[PDB]
Symmetry: D2
Subunit: 252 residues, 4 copies
C-alpha cells in the first residue's frame, strides 16, 4: 500500500520507512530538509526504494502523496521536537507552546487531513511515534513529557471513533531507541561510544541496551500489515524494560 513517514531522517523515521519499504509499500517520506531540492535529491539517490516529498504542511503533504500515488493507506506521524531540560519557572510559556505545536498539533493536523479519505473507503492505519517518558518522567522536562502524553491519549481517543471505519490507531512510545546519526534523542555518539552513557543504558533498561531502529521498523510494519488490527488504541512502550528502579541498600 502507500505509506507516509514524517521527519524521516530522525527519531523513528529511517527504521519505519526502510522496513515498510521492504514490506513492499510505497513510502512517501517527509522531512524539513526536503524543502531544499538539493537535500531531497540527495536522499532520493541514496534511497531509491523511498519516495521523498518536498511538501511541508499537513494538508499539502497528504494531497501530494494522494495525487502522486493514489491515496494514503498508512500514516506514520514520527514527531520530533528539540527540548531543553529546564525548571518550570525558567521555561518561557512559548517553550511549551512550541512543544505542543510539534508533538500534539502536528499529529492531529495530519489525521485531520487524511481521515476523510480513509473513512470513505473504510481502511487505513494510523501510527503516532510518541514517547515513553510519560510512563516514567524525569524532573525538568515538563514541557516535552506532558506534550507527548497528550499525543498518546490523542491516539487512544481517535481509535474509538475510527474503529467504526475499520481504521486502527496506535501510539508507539520509545525511549533509549538508537537514532544512529540523528541527534533526535539517542545518536551513536555518545550512546554507543562513551563509557558513562553505555553504563547508563545498561543500568536504566531491563535489556541493558538501546533499542534498534530495526525493532521499531518491525513493529511499525507489523501494525501496518493489518496482521493485528485488534490492538487498536494501544500505546506501546518500546523502552526495553525501562525504567529499572533503584533497589534498597545492600542489593546489587
Amino acid at each position: 500500500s502507500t505509506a507516509i513517514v514524517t521527519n524521516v531522517k530522525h527519531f523513528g523515521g529511517m527504521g519505519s520507512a526502510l522496513r515498510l519499504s521492504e514490506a513492499g509499500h510505497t513510502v512517501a517520506c517527509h522531512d524539513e530538509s526536503f524543502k531544499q531540492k538539493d537535500e531531497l535529491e540527495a536522499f532520493a539517490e541514496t534511497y531509491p526504494q523511498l519516495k521523498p516529498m518536498s511538501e511541508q504542511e499537513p494538508a499539502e503533504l497528504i494531497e501530494a502523496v494522494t495525487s502522486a500515488y493514489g491515496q494514503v493507506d498508512v500514516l506514520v506521524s514520527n514527531d520530533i521536537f528539540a527540548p531543553e531540560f529546564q525548571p518550570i519557572d525558567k521555561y518561557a510559556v512559548e517553550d511549551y507552546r512550541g512543544a505542543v505545536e510539534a508533538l500534539q498539533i502536528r499529529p492531529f493536523a495530519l489525521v485531520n487531513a487524511v481521515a476523510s479519505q480513509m473513512k470513505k473507503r473504510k481502511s487505513g492505519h494510523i501510527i503516532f511515534i510518541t514517547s515513553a517518558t510519560p510512563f516514567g518522567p524525569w524532573k525538568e522536562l515538563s514541557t516535552y513529557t506532558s506534550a507527548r502524553a497528550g499525543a498518546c491519549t490523542l491516539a487512544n481517543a481517535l481509535s474509538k471513533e475510527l474503529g467504526e471505519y475499520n481504521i486502527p490507531v496506535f501510539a508507539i512510545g520509545p525511549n533509549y531507541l538508537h537514532s544512529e546519526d540523528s541527534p533526535y534523542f539517542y545518536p551513536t555518539e555518545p550512546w554507543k561510544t562513551n563509557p558513562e552513557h553505555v553504563a547508563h543504558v545498561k543500568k536504566v533498561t531491563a535489556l541493558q541496551r538501546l533499542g534498534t531502529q530495526k525493532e521499531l521498523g518491525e513493529l511499525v510494519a507489523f501494525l501496518a500489515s493489518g496482521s493485528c488490527d485488534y490492538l487498536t488504541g494501544q500505546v506501546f512502550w518500546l523502552a526495553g524494560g525501562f525504567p529499572m528502579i533503584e533497589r534498597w541498600p545492600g542489593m546489587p
Copy 2:
C-alpha cells in the same frame, strides 16, 4: 494561608473556593467575568468571604495576589474549555489549539509564574483540576480529552521537580461533577432534573449520582492543608466509579 482559584464560577471553582475559605484560607478568585466591575462587585457581595480579582493573565494575577495578600501558598488551576464533539476530520486545527491553550498552556503558565516564590520559601501546594476523560475516552472528543491528558501528566511531571522544594503537586480529574449553575460540564438543569440525563448518570457511574461540589471542595482543602503531602504526583479520579461497563446480554 493564601490561595488562588481560577475560573471560580465554573467547574470545580465554587466548591474549591468555598471549602478553602471555610478552612480559614484567604482565597483570591479569578474569572473571565471579573473583567466587568459589575460582575466582580456582585460576586464580592454574594460571597464576601472570597476576594475576587479583576486580573486575567497568569503573571498579572500572581503578581496582584502576591502584592495584595503577601504571597501565593496554594494554586488551584481550575481550567475550563467549551469543546464540541466532532469526528476528527470535522474539527478545525484551531479547535485543538484552543483546547490545548485553555487546558495545558494556561495551567503551565500559572505554575511558571508562581513557582519561583514557592521554591524560595520551600512551601506551597499546586492543584490542577483536569478531567477523568483520559481514563475513559468517549468517541468524538479527541481535542478536549487529549489536552486534559497533557494537563494530568504536566502535574505528575512537575511533582518530580518540585518535590525537592517541598511543593506537592496534584491533578484532580472529575467527571459527572455537578456544576450547579455553571454550564461547565454538569449543571443542575438538566442533569438532576431530566429523566434521560438522571438515568444516564445512574448507568455510567458506580455510585449512580453526580459528584458534589462539596466533595471536590473537601478534597482540594484536604490536599492544600498539608495533611497528606505524600500523595504528591497523584492523579485523582473523582468520577464516582465511572466508567460502568455494559455487561453481556441477559445480565442485570
Copy 3:
C-alpha cells in the same frame, strides 16, 4: 525453535499454536484433556503439525518437552478459569483461591520451572495470555478480574529481572476474542450467531467485531520471533478498542 502452548484447545491456545507452527517452530501443546490417551491422539491426528503432551504439571511438562525437543525456547502460558459472576458476599473464599491458582499460580509455576534453562543460555521468550478486564472491570467478577491483574503485573515484574538474561516477557490481555468451539469466553455460538450478542459486540468494541484467533496468533508469533524484544514488559490490550463508553443523551 521449541515452543510450549498450554490449554491449547481453549482461549488463545489454537491461534497461538497454529501460527507458531506456521512460523516453523516445533509446538508442544498441553491441555487437561491430553491426560486421556484417546483425546491426545485425536488431537494429534487432526493437527499433525502440533505435538500434544500428556504431562499436566509445570515441572513435568517443561521437563518432558526439554527431553523430547531439546529445550523450551518459547513459553505461551495460555491460562484459563471458569468463573461465575457473583456479588462479593455470594462467593466462597475458595472461589477466589481457585481463580488465583489457575490464573496466577500456574503461570508463575511454569516460569519458575523454565527460567533457569533460559537464563543459562541467555535466550528465550515468555508470553502470558491474560485479560483486558482489569482495564475495564464489570461488576460482580471480582475474583477473575483481580487474579488476571496479578498475572499482568507478574509478567511486567518478571521482565525487569529476566531482561538481564536477554529474555523478553509479555502479557497479552484479550477481550471479545473469538474462541470458536471453545467456551472459554467467546465461542462462535452465540457470539457470531445471536442478534443480541452480535449487537453487543458491535456496541462495546471500537472495531465493532470480535477479535480473531488469527490476530492473536500473529501477535504471539511476532513477539516470539525475536523481531521486537524491546517491547519487553508490555501488557497488550487485544480488545479492539474496548471499552466504548456510553455518551451523553442525544448522541448516537
Copy 4:
C-alpha cells in the same frame, strides 16, 4: 461509626487506628499477637482509645466486632507479608501462594464477610492498604509485587458493584512509608538513622523523605468520613513522588 483496622501494630496500622480514633470512631483492632491475652491486654492499656480484639479469622472478627459494637461501618484491611527478594527460579511456588494468601485472599475474605451487612444498610467504607510497588516494580520481588497488584484491582473491581449500595471502596498503595517500630517495610532503624538508607530515600522519592504514619492516618480518616465518596475506585499512590528516575550522564 465503628471501624476495624487489621494488623494494627504493623504497616499502616497504627496511623490508621490512631487517627480514626481521634476522629471519634470506635476502632476495633486485630493483630496476630492479640491471640495472646498478654499481648492484647498490654496493647489495650497503652491505647485506651482503641479496642483490640482477639479474633483472628475474617468471619469471626466481623461477627465479634458487630456483636460488641453494633456493626462494622469501616473496614481498613491493612495487609502484610514478609517476602524475600529472589530470581523467579529460586522462589518456591509455595512462596507465591503465601504472598497471595496474605495480600489477596485475606482482604477478599474480610470484604466477603462484611459486605452483606453494609449493603443491607446501604452504607459503609472499604479501604485496602496495598502497595505502590506495582507502579514501579523492582527486579526480584515478583511474588509480593504481583499479589499487591491483585489487591489493588480487587478494590477497584469491588467499587463497581458496591457503588450501587453507596459503599465506596479504595486502595492506598504506600511505599517508603515510615513504620516506626514495625519491621513491616520501613522501621525507624535503619531508615531514619543509617546514612546509606537515608540517602536512598532521598534519591528515590520526590519529597526526599519517608512518608509519615500521620499522613497515612489522615488519608484513611478523610476517606472514612464520607467527605469524599466520589473517589470510590481510586488507587492512591502514597509514595512521595516515587519513583525518581535516574537521568542522563552529567545531569545533576
